[PDB]
Amino acid sequence: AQNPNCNIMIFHPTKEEFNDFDKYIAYMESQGAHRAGLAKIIPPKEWKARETYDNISEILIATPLQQVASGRAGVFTQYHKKKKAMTVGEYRHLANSKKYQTPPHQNFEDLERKYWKNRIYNSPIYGADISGSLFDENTKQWNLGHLGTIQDLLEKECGVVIEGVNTPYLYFGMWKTTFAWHTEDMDLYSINYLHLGEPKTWYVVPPEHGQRLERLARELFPGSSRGCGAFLRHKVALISPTVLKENGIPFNRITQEAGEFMVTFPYGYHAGFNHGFNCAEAINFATPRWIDYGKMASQCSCGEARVTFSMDAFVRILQPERYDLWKRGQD
Ligand SMILES: O=C(O)CNC(=O)C(=O)O
Ligand SMILES: [Mg+2]
Ligand code: NI
Ligand SMILES: [Zn+2]
User: What are the binding residues for Zn(2+)?
Assistant: First the structure.
C-alpha cells in the first residue's frame, strides 16, 4: 500500500504532466496521496493563473462575515456575523489596519503558536463563498473555472442525467480568518488555488480515520452533537493541534503559499487559518472513486447546514432513502 503513514504529499508536475487534470489526480492517488486527505501541487514554473492581479480591488464582497469565537483557546465555535458590503480594495485596507494586521513573528511556527493562543480574543472579517473566478480564460491548464462538472462525472459513471451546475468560489482572508473542521458537501474533493497574498495553514485528518475526529467532536461539543447527527456540516467547530494530540487523533499540517494548489480528498476532514491578506479560489470536483463516498456521506437534517441547489440531485440519486428527510431540513 502506498503512503501507509498517510503523510501529506507534495507534487511538482512538469508542463507536460499539467495538461490532463484527471490523469494527474489519478497519478497522485496511485502514489497514495489521498490517504493523507490533502495534497499540495506546485505548478510548473512556466504556468500562470493570470498576467497580473492589478485590477481586483473592484470585486465586491457583498456579505463580509465577522467570525466571533466562543469557548476556550483550543476548543471553540465560531459564528458568522454579517457585515455591510465592501470592495476588495476596502477589505485589503481593513486587513492591513493596525486592528487586524498580522503581528510581528519569527516564522510560520511562531505565527501558528500565536494563532492558537490568541484567536478567540479577536473577530477577524472573512469574505467567503463569493461566486466567481480569477483565472484568465486563456489559462488552459488547471483553470478552476474550466473543470469537468460533477454532474457530468455522475452521468459518465452512472448514466443518469441531472440538473445542477458547479462553479468556483473566491475567498478573501485576513489574519486569523478561520475555516472550521469539515469535509466537503457529499464528501466531494475540493481544489483550492492561493492566487495572492499571505499563506494559509491547513490541518487534515486521514479519511480512514475521520470517524475518530467525529467521536472526539461529539465529546467536545456535546449539545451540538445532540442537536444534529452531522453537526460538523455546520462548519463552526475548531479543535487545536494540541487538543488533537492530547486525544490521539491522527492528523497532519502544511502551509500553502501564493501560487500553490491544494487538493482535499473525499472524507478528508480539514480546518485552517490565514496568515494575512489573501485571495483563494476553490471548487468541488469528483472522480470515479468519489462515487462510493458520495453514497455514504452524512447529512445535516436539523436545517442549519443549508446547502446548494446542485446538492439536491446528488442526494436524490445517490441517497434516495435519505432524500425525503434531508429535504425536510432544506425546506
Ligand atoms: O480557503 C478556505 O477558506 C476554505 N477552503 C476549503 O475548505 C477548501 O478549499 O476545501
Ligand atoms: Mg476589480
Ligand atoms: Ni473545504
Ligand atoms: Zn445540522
Answer: 228, 234, 300, 302
Q: How many domains does the chain have?
A: 1
Find out whether the beta carbon of 264 lies less than 6 Å from any atom of ligand 1.
yes
In Å, what resolution does this model reach? 1.6
Dihedral over Cα of 211, 248, 203, 128: its sign: positive
Q: Say which CATH number the domain at 284 has.
A: 2.60.120.650
- Can you read off the three cell numbers belonging to residue 302? 436539523
Take residue 26 and report the three cell numbers written for it: 489519478
Question: What pairing do the DSSP bridges indicate for beta strands 189-197 and 278-285?
Answer: antiparallel
- Beta pairing partners, 253: 203
Tell me which residue of 116, 73, 61 sits closest to 273, measured CA to CA.
Answer: 116
Question: Is the CB of residue 182 less than 8 Å from the CB of residue 272?
Answer: no
Check pocket membership of 283 for ligand 1, CB cut-off 6 A.
no
Q: What is the dihedral of CA 112, 113, 119, 124, to 10 degrees?
A: -40
* Domain span including residue 59: 1-331
Which residues are within 5 Å of ligand 4 (an ion), measured at CB? 228, 300, 302, 304
